[PDB]
């Protein structure tokens, strides 16, 4: 929903975005340009909704009045990343997006990268690789049917079969410097954006959540100076779009809640 | 529903007016009459209908705009 407005933006698997007016109960416009399913969408007070197309690995910002769109692409390569260092995983798809600002937004991908974007620059301004860590290594008792343990270990191929956690959820409180990310790692990580909006750091973690964080929301109450923030996250045993993820030990279906106070 | 957008808005005090390009989206509709567009533009700009003029409307091939 466009903030403080009746305009709704719907992303569809037919590679199109549909806009509705709930008060008039009517469809207004279809937006074209994505080459794969539009997985997630976010909006703020302005009509500038942003979207991510999953496997096409492109984030698009739509200027509905101007009838123009801005295309953002990651374009990162492990070869250069490793050489400059002298485990980096190539980006597969962008699954989540949230608008920090009318001129800034963040995205989360299946390689565990959390990227900060600016409308001025097509490339990311800052990236946080493997944000939620690496998946547990597969058990050697299950990889192979060999009796000898060393043979089973060789099938693990060292660290080559290790893959990162996906960013299943990503939410930024509007017009603030804090956003929350989620996965099935078992914790919600809270990040803080720099004052110049050129970087961010890990503020903390909330380990109560166990399972797949499908969606995150934040609500605040109290006086202007003194505000309590409640983080509500839907937790599930399976990913929202499909049943690919192997059953996570201890995962449960429920609503995760965390009330946070401000003092200083 | 019908959407009306104005773009390339120029304030022209030489002729005492505002000039713009009007894009009309009318899904599942043949087109929007000049009278109805004038009414809605008058509401949008907070001006009398008599002060609103619209012309030169060409429908896009395939319809809908």
């Amino acid at each position: 929903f466009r903030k403080n407005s009746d305009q709704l933006y719907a992303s569809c698997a037919d590679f199109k975005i549909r806009t509705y007016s709930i008060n008039q109960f009517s469809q207004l416009e279809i937006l074209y340009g994505h080459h794969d399913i539009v997985e997630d969408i976010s909006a703020l007070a302005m009509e500038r909704c942003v979207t991510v197309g999953a496997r096409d690995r492109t984030a698009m910002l739509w200027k509905i009045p101007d009838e123009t769109r801005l295309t953002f692409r990651g374009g990162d390569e492990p070869q250069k990343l490793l050489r400059r260092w002298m485990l980096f995983f190539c980006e597969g798809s962008i699954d989540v997006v949230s608008m920090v600002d009318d001129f800034h937004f963040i995205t989360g991908s299946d390689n565990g990268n959390i990227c900060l974007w600016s409308l001025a620059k097509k490339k990311p301004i800052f990236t946080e690789r493997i944000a939620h860590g690496i998946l547990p290594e597969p058990s050697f008792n299950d990889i192979s049917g060999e009796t000898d343990e060393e043979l089973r270990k060789r099938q693990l191929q060292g660290k080559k079969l290790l893959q990162p956690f996906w960013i299943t959820s990503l939410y930024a409180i509007p017009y603030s410097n804090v956003f929350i990310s989620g996965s099935w790692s078992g914790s919600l990580k809270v990040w803080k954006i720099s004052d110049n909006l050129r970087s961010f750091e890990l503020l903390g973690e909330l380990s109560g959540a166990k399972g797949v964080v499908t969606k995150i929301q934040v609500v605040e109450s109290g006086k202007h100076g003194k505000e309590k923030f409640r983080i509500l996250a839907s937790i599930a045993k399976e990913h929202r779009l499909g049943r690919w993820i192997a059953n996570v030990s201890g995962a449960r279906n429920g609503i995760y809640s965390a009330v946070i106070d401000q003092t200083g | 529903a019908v959407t009306i957008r104005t773009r390339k808005v120029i304030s022209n005090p030489l002729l005492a007016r505002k000039q713009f390009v009007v894009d009309v989206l009318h899904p599942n509709r043949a087109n929007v009459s000049k009278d109805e567009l004038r009414e809605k533009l008058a509401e949008v700009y907070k001006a009398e209908k008599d002060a609103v003029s619209v012309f030169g409307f060409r429908t896009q091939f395939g319809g809908g705009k």
Binding site: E47 | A1, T3, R5, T6, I10, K40, V44
Partner: peptide, 23 residues
């Protein structure tokens, strides 16, 4: 040693687009 008035500042346009929906 190398031997080598300002133009008027540009203005953001006064008017912007307006959008409405009906029916």
């Amino acid at each position: 040693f190398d031997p080598s008035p300002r133009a008027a500042k540009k203005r953001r346009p006064a008017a912007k687009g307006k959008n409405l929906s009906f029916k």
